[PDB]
CSV table of C-alpha atoms and ligand atoms in Angstrom, one decimal:
chain,number,residue,atom,x,y,z
A,1,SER,CA,0.0,0.0,0.0
A,2,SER,CA,2.0,3.0,-1.4
A,3,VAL,CA,1.1,6.6,-2.3
A,4,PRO,CA,0.9,7.2,-5.2
A,5,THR,CA,0.3,4.1,-7.2
A,6,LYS,CA,0.4,2.7,-10.8
A,7,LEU,CA,3.2,4.9,-11.7
A,8,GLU,CA,4.3,4.3,-15.4
A,9,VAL,CA,5.9,6.1,-18.4
A,10,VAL,CA,3.1,7.1,-20.8
A,11,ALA,CA,5.1,9.0,-23.4
A,12,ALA,CA,8.8,8.6,-24.0
A,13,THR,CA,11.4,10.0,-26.3
A,14,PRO,CA,15.1,9.8,-26.6
A,15,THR,CA,15.4,12.7,-24.1
A,16,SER,CA,12.2,13.2,-22.2
A,17,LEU,CA,9.6,11.0,-20.4
A,18,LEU,CA,6.0,11.7,-19.4
A,19,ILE,CA,5.1,9.8,-16.2
A,20,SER,CA,1.7,9.3,-14.8
A,21,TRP,CA,0.4,7.9,-11.4
A,22,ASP,CA,-2.7,7.4,-9.6
A,23,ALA,CA,-3.5,10.2,-7.3
A,24,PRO,CA,-5.4,8.9,-4.2
A,25,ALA,CA,-9.0,9.9,-3.9
A,26,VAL,CA,-8.0,12.1,-1.0
A,27,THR,CA,-5.6,14.9,-2.3
A,28,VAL,CA,-2.2,15.1,-0.9
A,29,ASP,CA,-0.3,18.4,-0.3
A,30,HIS,CA,2.4,17.8,-3.1
A,31,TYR,CA,4.6,15.0,-4.5
A,32,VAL,CA,8.4,14.9,-4.8
A,33,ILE,CA,9.9,13.3,-7.9
A,34,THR,CA,13.5,12.2,-7.7
A,35,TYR,CA,15.1,10.7,-10.9
A,36,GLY,CA,18.5,9.9,-12.2
A,37,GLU,CA,20.8,7.3,-13.7
A,38,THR,CA,20.2,4.1,-11.6
A,39,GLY,CA,23.1,4.0,-9.0
A,40,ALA,CA,24.8,7.3,-10.1
A,41,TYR,CA,23.5,9.4,-7.0
A,42,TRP,CA,25.5,12.4,-8.1
A,43,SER,CA,23.1,12.7,-11.0
A,44,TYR,CA,19.9,12.3,-9.1
A,45,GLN,CA,17.6,15.4,-9.5
A,46,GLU,CA,14.2,16.2,-7.8
A,47,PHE,CA,11.3,18.5,-8.3
A,48,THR,CA,7.8,18.8,-6.7
A,49,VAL,CA,4.3,18.7,-8.4
A,50,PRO,CA,1.2,19.8,-6.5
A,51,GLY,CA,-1.2,17.4,-5.0
A,52,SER,CA,-3.7,18.1,-7.6
A,53,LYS,CA,-1.3,17.0,-10.4
A,54,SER,CA,-1.0,13.2,-11.3
A,55,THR,CA,1.3,13.6,-14.2
A,56,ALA,CA,4.8,14.9,-14.5
A,57,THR,CA,7.3,15.3,-17.4
A,58,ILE,CA,11.1,14.5,-17.0
A,59,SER,CA,13.3,16.0,-19.7
A,60,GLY,CA,17.1,16.4,-20.2
A,61,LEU,CA,17.9,12.8,-20.2
A,62,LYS,CA,20.7,10.7,-21.8
A,63,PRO,CA,19.9,8.0,-24.3
A,64,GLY,CA,20.3,4.3,-23.6
A,65,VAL,CA,20.7,5.0,-19.9
A,66,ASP,CA,18.7,3.3,-17.2
A,67,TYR,CA,16.9,5.7,-15.0
A,68,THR,CA,15.0,5.3,-11.7
A,69,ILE,CA,12.0,7.4,-11.0
A,70,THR,CA,10.6,7.7,-7.4
A,71,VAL,CA,7.5,9.7,-6.5
A,72,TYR,CA,7.2,10.7,-2.8
A,73,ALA,CA,3.9,11.9,-1.5
A,74,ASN,CA,3.7,14.6,1.2
A,75,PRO,CA,0.4,14.7,3.3
A,76,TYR,CA,1.5,17.6,5.4
A,77,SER,CA,0.9,21.3,4.4
A,78,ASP,CA,3.5,22.6,7.0
A,79,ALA,CA,6.1,19.8,7.5
A,80,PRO,CA,8.9,18.5,5.2
A,81,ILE,CA,8.7,15.3,3.5
A,82,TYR,CA,10.8,13.2,5.7
A,83,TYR,CA,7.8,13.2,8.2
A,84,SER,CA,5.8,11.6,5.5
A,85,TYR,CA,4.0,8.2,6.4
A,86,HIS,CA,3.7,7.2,2.7
A,87,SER,CA,5.9,4.7,1.1
A,88,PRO,CA,7.1,6.0,-2.3
A,89,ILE,CA,6.4,4.3,-5.6
A,90,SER,CA,9.4,3.8,-8.0
A,91,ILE,CA,10.0,2.8,-11.7
A,92,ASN,CA,12.7,2.3,-14.0
A,93,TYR,CA,12.9,3.4,-17.7
A,94,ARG,CA,15.6,2.9,-20.2
A,95,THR,CA,16.4,5.6,-22.7
B,1,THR,CA,25.4,32.1,38.3
B,2,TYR,CA,22.3,30.0,37.9
B,3,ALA,CA,20.1,33.1,38.8
B,4,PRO,CA,16.4,32.9,38.3
B,5,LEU,CA,16.6,36.0,35.9
B,6,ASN,CA,19.1,34.1,33.9
B,7,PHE,CA,16.7,31.2,33.1
B,8,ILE,CA,14.1,33.9,32.2
B,9,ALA,CA,16.4,35.5,29.7
B,10,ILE,CA,17.2,32.1,28.0
B,11,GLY,CA,13.6,31.0,27.7
B,12,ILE,CA,12.3,34.4,26.5
B,13,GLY,CA,15.3,34.4,24.0
B,14,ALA,CA,14.9,30.9,22.7
B,15,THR,CA,11.0,31.1,22.4
B,16,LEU,CA,11.3,34.2,20.1
B,17,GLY,CA,14.2,32.8,17.9
B,18,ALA,CA,12.4,29.5,17.7
B,19,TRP,CA,9.2,31.1,16.5
B,20,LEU,CA,11.0,33.2,13.9
B,21,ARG,CA,12.9,30.1,12.6
B,22,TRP,CA,9.6,28.1,12.5
B,23,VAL,CA,7.8,30.8,10.4
B,24,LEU,CA,10.8,31.1,8.1
B,25,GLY,CA,10.8,27.4,7.5
B,26,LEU,CA,7.0,27.4,6.8
B,27,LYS,CA,7.0,30.3,4.4
B,28,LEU,CA,10.4,29.9,2.9
B,29,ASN,CA,11.6,26.2,2.8
B,30,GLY,CA,11.2,25.9,-0.9
B,31,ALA,CA,10.6,22.8,-3.4
B,32,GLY,CA,14.2,21.7,-3.7
B,33,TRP,CA,16.2,23.9,-1.3
B,34,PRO,CA,15.6,24.5,2.5
B,35,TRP,CA,15.6,28.3,2.2
B,36,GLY,CA,13.8,28.6,5.5
B,37,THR,CA,16.4,27.0,7.6
B,38,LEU,CA,19.4,28.2,5.5
B,39,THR,CA,18.1,31.8,6.0
B,40,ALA,CA,17.9,31.4,9.8
B,41,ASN,CA,21.3,29.9,9.8
B,42,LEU,CA,23.1,32.5,7.6
B,43,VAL,CA,21.3,35.4,9.4
B,44,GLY,CA,21.9,33.9,12.8
B,45,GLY,CA,25.5,33.4,11.6
B,46,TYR,CA,25.9,37.0,10.6
B,47,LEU,CA,24.3,38.2,13.9
B,48,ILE,CA,26.5,36.3,16.1
B,49,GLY,CA,29.6,37.9,14.6
B,50,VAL,CA,28.1,41.3,15.4
B,51,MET,CA,27.1,40.2,19.0
B,52,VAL,CA,30.3,38.6,19.9
B,53,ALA,CA,32.4,41.5,18.5
B,54,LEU,CA,29.9,43.8,20.2
B,55,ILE,CA,30.2,42.0,23.6
B,56,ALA,CA,34.0,42.3,23.2
B,57,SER,CA,34.1,46.1,23.2
B,58,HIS,CA,31.3,46.5,25.8
B,59,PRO,CA,32.3,44.5,28.7
B,60,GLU,CA,30.0,46.6,30.9
B,61,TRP,CA,26.8,45.1,29.8
B,62,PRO,CA,24.9,42.7,32.1
B,63,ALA,CA,25.3,38.9,32.0
B,64,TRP,CA,21.7,38.7,30.8
B,65,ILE,CA,22.2,40.6,27.6
B,66,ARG,CA,24.4,38.0,26.2
B,67,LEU,CA,22.3,35.1,27.5
B,68,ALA,CA,19.2,36.7,26.1
B,69,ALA,CA,20.4,37.5,22.5
B,70,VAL,CA,23.2,35.0,21.9
B,71,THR,CA,22.3,32.1,24.2
B,72,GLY,CA,18.5,32.9,23.9
B,73,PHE,CA,17.7,34.3,20.4
B,74,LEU,CA,20.4,33.1,18.3
B,75,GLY,CA,20.4,29.8,20.0
B,76,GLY,CA,16.9,29.2,19.1
B,77,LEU,CA,16.9,30.9,15.7
B,78,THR,CA,19.7,28.6,14.3
B,79,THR,CA,19.6,24.8,14.4
B,80,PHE,CA,21.8,21.8,13.7
B,81,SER,CA,19.3,19.1,14.2
B,82,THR,CA,17.0,20.5,11.5
B,83,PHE,CA,19.9,20.9,9.1
B,84,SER,CA,21.2,17.3,9.4
B,85,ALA,CA,17.8,15.9,9.2
B,86,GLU,CA,17.3,17.7,6.0
B,87,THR,CA,20.6,16.8,4.7
B,88,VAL,CA,20.3,13.1,5.7
B,89,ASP,CA,16.9,13.1,4.0
B,90,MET,CA,18.5,14.3,0.8
B,91,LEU,CA,21.1,11.5,1.0
B,92,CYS,CA,18.2,9.0,1.8
B,93,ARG,CA,16.5,9.9,-1.5
B,94,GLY,CA,19.6,9.8,-3.4
B,95,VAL,CA,20.2,13.5,-4.3
B,96,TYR,CA,23.8,13.5,-3.2
B,97,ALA,CA,24.7,16.7,-5.3
B,98,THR,CA,22.0,18.6,-3.4
B,99,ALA,CA,23.1,17.3,0.0
B,100,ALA,CA,26.7,18.3,-0.8
B,101,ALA,CA,25.7,21.7,-2.1
B,102,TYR,CA,23.5,22.1,1.0
B,103,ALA,CA,26.1,21.1,3.4
B,104,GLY,CA,28.6,23.5,1.8
B,105,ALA,CA,26.3,26.5,1.6
B,106,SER,CA,25.4,25.9,5.3
B,107,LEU,CA,29.0,25.4,6.6
B,108,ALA,CA,30.9,27.9,4.4
B,109,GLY,CA,28.2,30.4,4.2
B,110,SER,CA,27.6,30.4,7.9
B,111,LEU,CA,31.5,30.9,8.6
B,112,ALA,CA,31.7,33.7,6.0
B,113,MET,CA,28.4,35.4,7.4
B,114,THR,CA,29.8,35.2,10.9
B,115,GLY,CA,33.1,36.7,9.5
B,116,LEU,CA,31.2,39.5,7.7
B,117,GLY,CA,29.4,40.0,11.0
B,118,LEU,CA,32.6,40.8,12.8
B,119,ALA,CA,34.2,42.7,10.0
B,120,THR,CA,31.1,45.1,10.2
B,121,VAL,CA,31.5,45.8,13.8
B,122,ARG,CA,35.2,46.5,13.6
B,123,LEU,CA,34.8,48.8,10.5
B,124,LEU,CA,32.0,50.6,12.3
B,125,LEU,CA,34.3,51.5,15.3
B,126,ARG,CA,37.0,52.5,12.9
C,1,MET,CA,-5.7,22.1,15.1
C,2,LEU,CA,-4.5,24.3,12.2
C,3,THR,CA,-1.1,26.0,11.4
C,4,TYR,CA,-0.5,29.2,13.4
C,5,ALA,CA,-2.7,28.0,16.4
C,6,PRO,CA,-1.9,29.6,19.8
C,7,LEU,CA,-1.1,26.1,21.2
C,8,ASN,CA,1.6,25.6,18.8
C,9,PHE,CA,3.6,28.7,19.7
C,10,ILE,CA,3.3,27.4,23.3
C,11,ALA,CA,4.6,24.0,22.5
C,12,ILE,CA,7.4,25.7,20.5
C,13,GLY,CA,8.4,28.2,23.3
C,14,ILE,CA,8.2,25.6,26.0
C,15,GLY,CA,10.3,23.1,23.9
C,16,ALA,CA,12.7,25.8,22.7
C,17,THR,CA,13.1,27.0,26.4
C,18,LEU,CA,14.0,23.6,27.9
C,19,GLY,CA,16.2,23.1,24.9
C,20,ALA,CA,18.3,26.2,25.5
C,21,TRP,CA,18.6,25.5,29.2
C,22,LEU,CA,20.0,22.1,28.4
C,23,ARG,CA,22.3,23.7,25.8
C,24,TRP,CA,23.3,26.5,28.2
C,25,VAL,CA,24.3,24.2,31.0
C,26,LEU,CA,26.2,21.8,28.6
C,27,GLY,CA,28.1,24.9,27.3
C,28,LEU,CA,29.2,25.7,30.8
C,29,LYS,CA,30.0,22.3,32.5
C,30,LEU,CA,31.8,20.7,29.6
C,31,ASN,CA,32.8,23.6,27.4
C,32,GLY,CA,36.5,24.7,27.7
C,33,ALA,CA,39.1,26.7,25.8
C,34,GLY,CA,40.8,25.0,23.0
C,35,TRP,CA,37.8,22.7,22.3
C,36,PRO,CA,34.1,23.2,22.9
C,37,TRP,CA,32.7,19.9,24.2
C,38,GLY,CA,29.5,21.5,25.4
C,39,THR,CA,28.5,22.8,21.8
C,40,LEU,CA,29.5,19.5,20.3
C,41,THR,CA,27.4,17.5,22.8
C,42,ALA,CA,24.3,19.6,22.2
C,43,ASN,CA,24.5,19.3,18.5
C,44,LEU,CA,25.5,15.5,18.5
C,45,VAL,CA,22.9,14.6,21.0
C,46,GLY,CA,20.3,16.7,19.2
C,47,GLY,CA,21.3,15.3,15.8
C,48,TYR,CA,20.8,11.8,17.1
C,49,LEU,CA,17.4,12.7,18.7
C,50,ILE,CA,16.0,14.3,15.6
C,51,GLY,CA,16.8,11.2,13.7
C,52,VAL,CA,14.7,9.4,16.4
C,53,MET,CA,11.8,11.8,16.5
C,54,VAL,CA,11.6,12.0,12.7
C,55,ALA,CA,11.5,8.2,12.5
C,56,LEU,CA,8.8,8.0,15.3
C,57,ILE,CA,6.5,10.6,13.7
C,58,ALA,CA,6.9,8.9,10.3
C,59,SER,CA,5.7,5.6,11.7
C,60,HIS,CA,2.9,7.3,14.0
C,61,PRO,CA,0.8,9.5,11.9
C,62,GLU,CA,-1.9,9.4,14.7
C,63,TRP,CA,0.1,11.4,17.1
C,64,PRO,CA,-0.9,15.1,17.4
C,65,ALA,CA,1.0,17.8,15.5
C,66,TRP,CA,2.3,19.4,18.7
C,67,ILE,CA,4.7,16.5,19.5
C,68,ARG,CA,6.6,17.5,16.4
C,69,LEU,CA,6.5,21.2,17.2
C,70,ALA,CA,7.4,20.7,20.7
C,71,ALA,CA,10.0,17.9,20.4
C,72,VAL,CA,11.6,18.8,17.2
C,73,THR,CA,10.9,22.5,16.3
C,74,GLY,CA,10.9,23.3,20.0
C,75,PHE,CA,13.2,21.2,22.2
C,76,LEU,CA,15.8,20.0,19.4
C,77,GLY,CA,15.6,23.6,18.0
C,78,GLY,CA,16.8,25.1,21.2
C,79,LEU,CA,19.2,22.3,21.9
C,80,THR,CA,21.2,22.3,18.7
C,81,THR,CA,22.8,25.4,17.4
C,82,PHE,CA,24.5,26.7,14.2
C,83,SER,CA,25.3,30.2,15.4
C,84,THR,CA,27.6,29.4,18.4
C,85,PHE,CA,29.3,26.7,16.3
C,86,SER,CA,30.1,29.2,13.5
C,87,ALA,CA,31.5,31.6,16.0
C,88,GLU,CA,33.7,29.1,17.8
C,89,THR,CA,34.9,27.8,14.5
C,90,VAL,CA,35.8,31.3,13.3
C,91,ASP,CA,37.7,31.8,16.5
C,92,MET,CA,39.8,28.8,15.8
C,93,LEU,CA,40.5,30.2,12.4
C,94,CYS,CA,41.5,33.6,13.6
C,95,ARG,CA,43.6,32.0,16.4
C,96,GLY,CA,45.7,30.3,13.8
C,97,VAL,CA,44.9,26.7,14.8
C,98,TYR,CA,43.5,25.6,11.4
C,99,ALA,CA,44.0,22.0,12.3
C,100,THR,CA,41.5,22.1,15.2
C,101,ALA,CA,39.1,24.2,13.0
C,102,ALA,CA,38.8,21.6,10.4
C,103,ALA,CA,38.6,18.9,13.1
C,104,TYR,CA,35.7,20.9,14.6
C,105,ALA,CA,33.6,21.4,11.4
C,106,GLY,CA,34.0,18.0,10.3
C,107,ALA,CA,33.4,16.6,13.8
C,108,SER,CA,30.1,18.4,14.3
C,109,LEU,CA,29.0,18.3,10.6
C,110,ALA,CA,29.8,14.7,9.8
C,111,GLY,CA,29.0,13.8,13.5
C,112,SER,CA,25.5,15.3,13.3
C,113,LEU,CA,24.7,13.5,10.0
C,114,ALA,CA,26.0,10.2,11.3
C,115,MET,CA,24.1,10.7,14.6
C,116,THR,CA,21.0,11.4,12.7
C,117,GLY,CA,21.4,8.2,10.8
C,118,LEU,CA,21.8,6.3,13.9
C,119,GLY,CA,18.7,8.0,15.4
C,120,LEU,CA,16.8,6.9,12.3
C,121,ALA,CA,18.5,3.3,12.5
C,122,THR,CA,17.7,3.1,16.3
C,123,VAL,CA,13.9,3.5,15.6
C,124,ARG,CA,13.9,1.4,12.5
C,125,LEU,CA,15.7,-1.4,14.5
C,126,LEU,CA,13.1,-1.7,17.2
C,127,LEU,CA,9.7,-1.1,15.7
C,128,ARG,CA,10.3,-3.7,13.1
D,1,LIG,C1,6.6,2.7,8.7
D,1,LIG,C2,7.6,3.6,8.2
D,1,LIG,C3,6.9,4.8,7.5
D,1,LIG,C4,8.0,5.5,6.6
D,1,LIG,C5,7.6,5.2,5.1
D,1,LIG,C6,8.8,5.8,4.3
D,1,LIG,C7,8.9,7.2,4.2
D,1,LIG,O1,8.7,8.0,5.0
D,1,LIG,O2,8.9,7.6,2.8
D,1,LIG,C8,9.0,9.1,2.6
D,1,LIG,C9,10.2,9.5,3.2
D,1,LIG,O3,10.1,9.8,4.6
D,1,LIG,C10,10.7,10.8,2.4
D,1,LIG,O4,12.0,11.0,2.8
D,2,LIG,C1,13.2,9.9,22.8
D,2,LIG,C2,11.8,9.3,22.8
D,2,LIG,C3,10.7,10.3,22.5
D,2,LIG,C4,9.2,9.6,22.6
D,2,LIG,C5,8.1,10.7,22.6
D,2,LIG,C6,6.8,9.9,22.3
D,2,LIG,C7,5.6,10.8,22.8
D,2,LIG,C8,4.3,10.2,22.3
D,2,LIG,O1,4.1,9.0,22.0
D,2,LIG,O2,3.4,11.2,22.1
D,2,LIG,C9,2.1,10.8,21.7
D,2,LIG,C10,1.3,10.1,22.8
D,2,LIG,O3,1.6,8.8,23.0
D,2,LIG,C11,-0.2,10.4,22.7
D,2,LIG,O4,-0.3,11.8,22.9
D,3,LIG,F1,21.3,25.1,6.8
D,4,LIG,F1,22.6,18.2,15.4
D,5,LIG,NA1,19.0,26.0,17.9
């Protein structure tokens, strides 16, 4: 039981990805997406999408590289994400 | 001296500094960079260079002025626990470049701000 | 409750107060010229405890929000300190002893992070 769920790549190009997930029926405050070359943590980046959003676009990627995309949900309106009680959902897309 | 008026200057000082740090975190802590706590640390770092240099040239001030503004306000304004929690969380999620950039900005910037806080007082008297 | 509630400022002030009193004594009983043991203990102890508090709150969503404002934003916010550390480190630099300066920044920087990791590990160890 994670939040969000059914994360996937809907549209993909050689240098961009469009990910989608199932926003829970109860809106969260915002999500935090972290992505990067699987293992290469000095390449990991992160951005935040509002709770109303259920899709995000990841651009500026390198071809043929295996990426890990993780989405963290923050239920708090006034606390950072490390206080969250939601297990993130993560996927992996190549290219 | 463990005087009752001493505990009253710490509590009143930390209570104010904490509140200001809290509100800074709420309104400022951005989407990828903790501007709220970094602000409280840099500012607090600059204000201690002024207070320390100021308490040096005014040894006639009472013992509660330093315990209220340095041990009280700045003691509660800046934090290390909230800094390492945030930094450790960045490492947890894998953003090592951000954690490194955040640690550096906090450490170097705090030292330099505390330096500029001393240089301003010494330049002010000369 | 909601954000900015009067009971929140109370939990922050009380926590920050008890946090500064503990930091103040520590900075007088163990703090000595050449090396500030008091300031290092307040930050290291605080760094470990916030790791514990963050792990507890994450696994106990039911707890009221004032446990976080009192224990973390309050207590651990008055216990730890970046200001006094920055001043002590800049004193070491102007006093020439660059070796102990680096030894201090690294000890309290990497020390805090490691202690936070242990705090997180301590909780993760027992709840499971
Ligand atoms: C039970 C433990 C609950 C913690 C779930 C994992 C979690 O908190 O994930 C988000 C993270 O805290 C963001 O840094
Ligand atoms: C260090 C240990 C800190 C433990 C603090 C836990 C306090 C707690 O559990 O608070 C919620 C309570 O159980 C219901 O109000
Ligand atoms: F910081
Ligand atoms: F700490
Ligand atoms: Na503090």
